[PDB]
Write a protein that binds this ligand. Sequence first.
Ligand code: K
Ligand code: K
Ligand code: K
Ligand code: K
Ligand code: MG
Ligand code: MG
Ligand code: MG
Ligand code: MG
Ligand code: MG
Ligand code: MG
Ligand code: MG
Ligand code: MG
Ligand code: MG
Ligand code: MG
Ligand code: MG
Ligand code: MG
Ligand code: MG
Ligand code: MG
Ligand code: MG
Ligand code: MG
Ligand code: MG
Ligand code: MG
Lengths: 117, 200, 69, 142, 420, 154
Amino acid sequence: TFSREQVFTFAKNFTGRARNVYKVALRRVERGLQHSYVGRKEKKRTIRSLWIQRINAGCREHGFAYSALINGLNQENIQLNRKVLSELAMHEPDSFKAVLDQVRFMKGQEIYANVEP
Amino acid sequence: VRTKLPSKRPFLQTASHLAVNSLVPSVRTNRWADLIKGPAVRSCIPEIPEVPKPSEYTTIGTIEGPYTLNLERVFGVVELAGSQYKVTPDDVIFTNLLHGIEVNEVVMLERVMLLGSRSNTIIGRPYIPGACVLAAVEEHFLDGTVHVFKRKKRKRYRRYKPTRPMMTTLRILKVLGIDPAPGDELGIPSGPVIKITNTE
Amino acid sequence: LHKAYAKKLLKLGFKRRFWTDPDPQMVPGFFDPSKYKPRERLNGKPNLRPDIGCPALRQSQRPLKKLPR
Amino acid sequence: QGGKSHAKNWGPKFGDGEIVFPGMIIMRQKQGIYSPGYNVGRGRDYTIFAKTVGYVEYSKLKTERGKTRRYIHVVPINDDWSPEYQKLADELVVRRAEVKRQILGHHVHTEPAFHFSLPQRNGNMSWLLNSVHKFPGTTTLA
Amino acid sequence: GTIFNTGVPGPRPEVAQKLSTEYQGHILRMISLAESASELDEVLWSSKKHLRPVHIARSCLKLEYLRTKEKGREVSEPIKNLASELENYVELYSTKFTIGQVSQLVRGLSSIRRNIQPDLLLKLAAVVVADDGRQVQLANEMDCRDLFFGFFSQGFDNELFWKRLSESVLPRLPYFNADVVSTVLRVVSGLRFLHNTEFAHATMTALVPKVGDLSPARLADAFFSASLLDPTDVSGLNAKLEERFLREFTSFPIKDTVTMFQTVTVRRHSTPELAAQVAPLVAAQAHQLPVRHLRRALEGMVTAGWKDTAEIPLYAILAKQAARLVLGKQSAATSAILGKHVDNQGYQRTPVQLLRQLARIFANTGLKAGPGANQPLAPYFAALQRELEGRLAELDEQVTDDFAESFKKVGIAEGARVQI
Amino acid sequence: LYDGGQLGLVKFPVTRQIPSYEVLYNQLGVSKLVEFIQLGLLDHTKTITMKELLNAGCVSSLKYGVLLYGNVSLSFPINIEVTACDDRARRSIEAAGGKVTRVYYTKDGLEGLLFPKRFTDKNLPLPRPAVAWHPKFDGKFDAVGQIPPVYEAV
RNA sequence: CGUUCUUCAACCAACGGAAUAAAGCUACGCUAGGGAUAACAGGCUUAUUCGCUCACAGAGUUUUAUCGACGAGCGCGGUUGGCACCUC
RNA sequence: CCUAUGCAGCUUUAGGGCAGGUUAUUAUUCAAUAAACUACCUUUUUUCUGGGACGGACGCUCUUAUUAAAGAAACAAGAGUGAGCAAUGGUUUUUACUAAUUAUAAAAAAGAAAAGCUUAACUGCAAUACAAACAAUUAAAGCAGGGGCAUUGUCGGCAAUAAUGCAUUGAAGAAAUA
RNA sequence: UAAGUCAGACGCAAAGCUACAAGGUUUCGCGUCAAAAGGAAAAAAGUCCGCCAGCGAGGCUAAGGUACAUAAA
RNA sequence: AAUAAAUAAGUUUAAUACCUUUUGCAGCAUGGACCAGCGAUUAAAUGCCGGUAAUUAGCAAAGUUAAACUAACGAAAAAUA
Ligand SMILES: [K+]
Ligand SMILES: [K+]
Ligand SMILES: [K+]
Ligand SMILES: [K+]
Ligand SMILES: [Mg+2]
Ligand SMILES: [Mg+2]
Ligand SMILES: [Mg+2]
Ligand SMILES: [Mg+2]
Ligand SMILES: [Mg+2]
Ligand SMILES: [Mg+2]
Ligand SMILES: [Mg+2]
Ligand SMILES: [Mg+2]
Ligand SMILES: [Mg+2]
Ligand SMILES: [Mg+2]
Ligand SMILES: [Mg+2]
Ligand SMILES: [Mg+2]
Ligand SMILES: [Mg+2]
Ligand SMILES: [Mg+2]
Ligand SMILES: [Mg+2]
Ligand SMILES: [Mg+2]
Ligand SMILES: [Mg+2]
Ligand SMILES: [Mg+2]
């Protein structure tokens, strides 16, 4: 069981009797800590959902689809994840478009260490 | 059989076979399956070779004193500590704890996946050979406390286990591999003075 | 005796070796005329009264009866 | 209103090729469905038991009157039907007891050890007591 | 049964009457009645706090009896571990044993081929010889017998130890049994420094009127020792021993007869008794003749000069017997199992020294092995080749030459395997 | 120990046999007597009595007497006086030429045998020996013990 | 007077039988407990009850105007029941 | 309303007692004993159960459904039993026979009946198994003694599956002590 | 462990009792709950997928989904 | 069930107290208005089974108490003489 010092440190921002009354605050503190364990798990699900929505919106502006892009990347051996792709569509439109054109049309110029073999 | 007492039949049969074997020798003395048993092997198929990857991070020197940084017009994507980062000079990133480095040291990151500017883009499949990113180690810190709590209503079950994660902080200094677009060149000194201490 | 029952008896301190106890008066030269007692027949009836009987032969203690008045 | 009689487990105890030792019960039955073969016996309630060391066998026979008869046999170890097999069985019985005692361990006692000796009657050991208990050999004539 | 749970053997009336008694000594009976090494270890473990020197002496003696039961193989792991633990108690009680207890302790540990540590062995010897052996007077015949043979087997060769022991036992030699005296004679023969002492002569003289009481095994050993000790036969023991052997030639076991027969042949007293000697060997050849005794029979017969006869090919059967022992093949026949034939005990690796000796003796016999399809010596060399193939590491330059000489002598020198 | 009401332990019969009074004696093995003599704790050149056994440590505490039992192979004579003996011990000692005598002592007489100094230090006469034993014990004793034993040579 | 062996008998049929034996009333009642268990109400079920369809035999006597059946299926939760899920 | 290591009061031809009065017998110059009547004291008055009461039931065998190993419950169903036999036991011989039980496809080197002789319907022990919480319950090779019928086999009751009761207390025959 | 437990529940599949009724009752085979968080079906003890040492804004899948609510043709 | 996880700070998503008792309770089943103090497997003797040591224990002071131990089948032959 938490001590008085621990309980009131956790409950400093609660409302009414939940702030300074031990019996009321102790039950409020334990329920809140239970919410946090569930919250950290759900955070990982929600953020990935947001990345996909932004990627899909950018793809369709050019006439493409999210599912077509993911399949196309794996065929080209490109391993950029969804967090990076989402940021490219929002802040780097030109680089995001270049990735789409390579996947769809494959018209990029290859680079070799020895330019003139 | 109705009884729940465990049966002793296997014990009674074993005692009979052991007594017979002890006193009466067998007639056969060989077994073909044992005679031609071959040597033990690890597997029946060739092993699958592994795919090489560029080095993650390596030290190249130390920082001598206070410095300043300016903004540039290039960016890249680098893989580090199990996750990818989009970085440009003067950025600060937070990663898991990195072993074998100290504060005020310069490290080299080679797993570069994408380079871009305002006039060109280079895509790695999956990595770009001949590109790198430089960074400075700024912190090895313990993050904020995370309180872990479990309880089961009406079962007299309660567990409390606070913890503090370990992390590392870096500041991006330079991105190498792609030239800035015309008119975007930084024509002044930008970074610190580095004492090179890694010659191979 | 069954193993479960035997351990309880041993745990309680049962250590008898003979069906009955020897009689010191039977040792030659050690007969005391003063401590003479005719041999008696051993009683085989357990005391099963739940009020003043053996606690090991009843489930719980019962209240005592009233005295005549 | 209800009630049920205690169950009797009729049926075989061993199959073909299983090893048995003297005295072991092979079949429990209410009527003589199976008849005794070689190296077996039959109780007054049609219980069939083995009389030697060997393996169990089953066989069917057609009689003169068209009826079907079923036998239970015990076959010697190496198909040895000579009269010298009896002494080999006696040795195997002694050995089997030794094997069991070794497996069980020393703390599974197989003989009693009292603070007194059991009486002797007709040259054997008896579990019944005598009227008076006396030390053996602590008295002289007259 | 009815008394105990399922699978628990019923009581033995013989054992039950021993344990159920009005008299004390329960722990001694438990260790004496143990039937295996593991059982005895459990008894000692559960009774550690009440063990005494008498309990330790019996425990070491029991190792002799357990080893005898487990014959046909070397000392097993459980026996070795049990002996090691017993030694710690011997050191603890080394100053509390009596002469009799020490005698039992040495005998038991010697029978298991266990070498007592020199420091501990010295302490035990000191106890026996302390006070000039005045405490040896309060000992029975069996205690003296085990003292002589027990220490001799251990290898204790202290001159002062044996000098004091001989002096104290000397006056009692005429009153010891024939078997006890024979054991003393064996020790005297093995100890060189007592060969020409008055003790050796006193022992031989004391044995003169007790020849008739010697057992067949002791009688055979006494005749062997007397031949080496008194080649001149001044005491007359050899004459008396030879006379008894002639009278009771067929009344002794095969092993004793072979040993006595070999001694006579090396004494150059051969007589036309070969016909009588051959029949017992062929009658009992599959049993009562291990590898060591088989070699002894060959040397005696070859030295005597008996030649192979059509009716009784003794050399031919001996080769088959030798091949059987080397290969170790067993038989499941009921007669063989009940007869306790030596060949069914299993496989026991034999020293290469015996193999060379047997090969040389067979070669000296004068019979062929290779040329004929079915020759008397064919089975032995065929088995020898198979056995040697699996132990090439033990073959050296000298051993190979020795066998090669034997192979050429018999008539196998073409570099090919034996026909059989 | 209550079993619910079945009371299975009291469903067994009762035996009333009286064990022999000799279970109250101290038991001494012949093999243990010899070991003391060999070690030198007992003098085998003179008669051995229960007083010597008590002082030597063979017997711990005597209230009634000493019972001698067992088999042993002896090479020298022994003369020992005890209260009871079996037949195995008698044969073992007599085989070597010894003599075993069963001596009858009373309660007061046994005290004088074991602790004579307890009477002389107080200037008290020693207890007197018994005259005879009850005929019911015929075949149990050979002679009446004397409080000061008469020692002899062996 | 006591012990052992060979044996039997009585109440144990509430038949693992023992505190030697041995019936009732309480609406004048009291205490400790249960929705682990009933009476009123809710719930589940639908045999029964009620309704509809098929069936058109039989009465009316050209009309399935009107009345109406053997037998089968489906529905209702309002009749008489079953269960013991919520509350002592 | 039901359930208790239940409590109390009341009632009686439920058990036991005599301790006041009456009555009966006996004894000394207000007493002693009690199968009686009144008064008083103390104790007992199961459980299961589609809630409890009312009714019914409580041991032990056979059979039916839950398939063709065993086992398996309900106040489910269909039938027996708390014995009998001095031969209807044991064992030999003969043959125009092959049944019956509460119920049942047992059984031909087996049974039934007929004829003869018999008491093993014993004394002292017993390997090893079936079953089983335990207690007890079931089958049994083999060893010693005395017997029966055969003349070298079988008999430690009855075709098999029910005809039963711990310990305590009491009683009888014999033997050993004191 | 000379411990606790001897109030069990439902799903699919059988049989007895009831009316080839009951979230009824009595046995039996497997599973789940009891003592089991997470995901799908609306809420969801017993159904379907699957067993939580901790943290992270990495990736691939199961049952089930892929015009809006609501991630994906 | 008045909080949690996040956020461009506008907001968005997740989310039916605890205890006791139960086959199953957010329970329309039981207890608590709140704070401070007080409030429940303790002691003795004996017995059984593990762990850790002493190497018999107590008195007395060359002698006594307590405990423990005390016959089971004398069975081995390893000599290249
Ligand atoms: K009852
Ligand atoms: K209510
Ligand atoms: K009901
Ligand atoms: K308040
Ligand atoms: Mg996830
Ligand atoms: Mg009935
Ligand atoms: Mg009862
Ligand atoms: Mg009330
Ligand atoms: Mg209810
Ligand atoms: Mg119910
Ligand atoms: Mg009731
Ligand atoms: Mg039992
Ligand atoms: Mg006969
Ligand atoms: Mg019969
Ligand atoms: Mg119950
Ligand atoms: Mg129950
Ligand atoms: Mg139900
Ligand atoms: Mg529960
Ligand atoms: Mg995917
Ligand atoms: Mg969408
Ligand atoms: Mg409920
Ligand atoms: Mg309240």
